Design a protein around this ligand. Structure first.
Ligand SMILES: CCOCCOCCOCCO
Ligand code: NA
Length: 55
Protein backbone atom coordinates (compact mmCIF):
# COMPACT_ATOMS: atom_id res chain seq x y z
CA UNK A 1 0.00 0.00 0.00
CA UNK A 2 2.21 2.78 -1.41
CA UNK A 3 1.61 6.51 -1.73
CA UNK A 4 3.50 9.38 -3.26
CA UNK A 5 3.26 12.72 -1.53
CA UNK A 6 5.04 16.05 -1.30
CA UNK A 7 7.30 17.04 1.64
CA UNK A 8 8.01 20.29 3.45
CA UNK A 9 11.57 21.16 4.53
CA UNK A 10 10.77 23.17 7.74
CA UNK A 11 8.73 20.46 9.40
CA UNK A 12 10.50 17.53 7.60
CA UNK A 13 7.14 15.96 6.84
CA UNK A 14 5.44 14.09 4.01
CA UNK A 15 1.86 15.01 3.04
CA UNK A 16 -0.01 12.41 1.11
CA UNK A 17 -3.61 11.95 0.20
CA UNK A 18 -4.86 8.59 1.50
CA UNK A 19 -7.35 6.28 -0.33
CA UNK A 20 -10.25 8.13 1.40
CA UNK A 21 -9.03 11.39 -0.16
CA UNK A 22 -7.81 12.73 3.20
CA UNK A 23 -4.51 14.57 3.41
CA UNK A 24 -2.28 12.93 5.99
CA UNK A 25 1.04 14.19 7.34
CA UNK A 26 3.73 11.79 8.49
CA UNK A 27 7.25 12.50 9.62
CA UNK A 28 10.19 12.09 7.27
CA UNK A 29 13.15 10.23 8.77
CA UNK A 30 16.05 12.21 10.22
CA UNK A 31 18.51 10.07 8.16
CA UNK A 32 20.37 12.00 5.41
CA UNK A 33 18.92 10.10 2.40
CA UNK A 34 15.32 10.03 3.71
CA UNK A 35 14.84 13.65 4.99
CA UNK A 36 13.00 16.36 3.05
CA UNK A 37 15.79 18.53 1.63
CA UNK A 38 13.59 21.02 -0.20
CA UNK A 39 9.98 22.23 0.00
CA UNK A 40 7.65 20.37 -2.38
CA UNK A 41 10.11 17.48 -3.09
CA UNK A 42 8.56 14.07 -3.52
CA UNK A 43 8.15 11.55 -0.72
CA UNK A 44 6.87 8.04 -0.46
CA UNK A 45 4.88 6.32 2.25
CA UNK A 46 4.58 2.57 2.42
CA UNK A 47 1.58 2.05 4.77
CA UNK A 48 2.13 -1.74 4.70
CA UNK A 49 5.61 -1.27 6.29
CA UNK A 50 4.86 2.20 7.78
CA UNK A 51 8.11 3.51 6.17
CA UNK A 52 8.67 7.06 4.85
CA UNK A 53 11.26 8.24 2.34
CA UNK A 54 11.51 11.95 1.54
CA UNK A 55 13.78 13.52 -1.01
C1 LIG B 1 7.45 12.86 18.87
C2 LIG B 1 7.87 11.41 18.92
O1 LIG B 1 9.10 11.29 19.63
C3 LIG B 1 9.58 9.94 19.68
C4 LIG B 1 11.00 9.95 20.23
O2 LIG B 1 11.54 8.63 20.28
C5 LIG B 1 12.82 8.54 19.65
C6 LIG B 1 12.86 7.33 18.74
O3 LIG B 1 13.55 7.62 17.51
C7 LIG B 1 12.73 7.47 16.35
C8 LIG B 1 12.73 6.03 15.86
O4 LIG B 1 12.07 5.97 14.59
NA1 NA C 1 14.88 10.11 -0.32
Amino acid sequence: AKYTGKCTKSKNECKYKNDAGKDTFIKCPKFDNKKCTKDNNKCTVDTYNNAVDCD
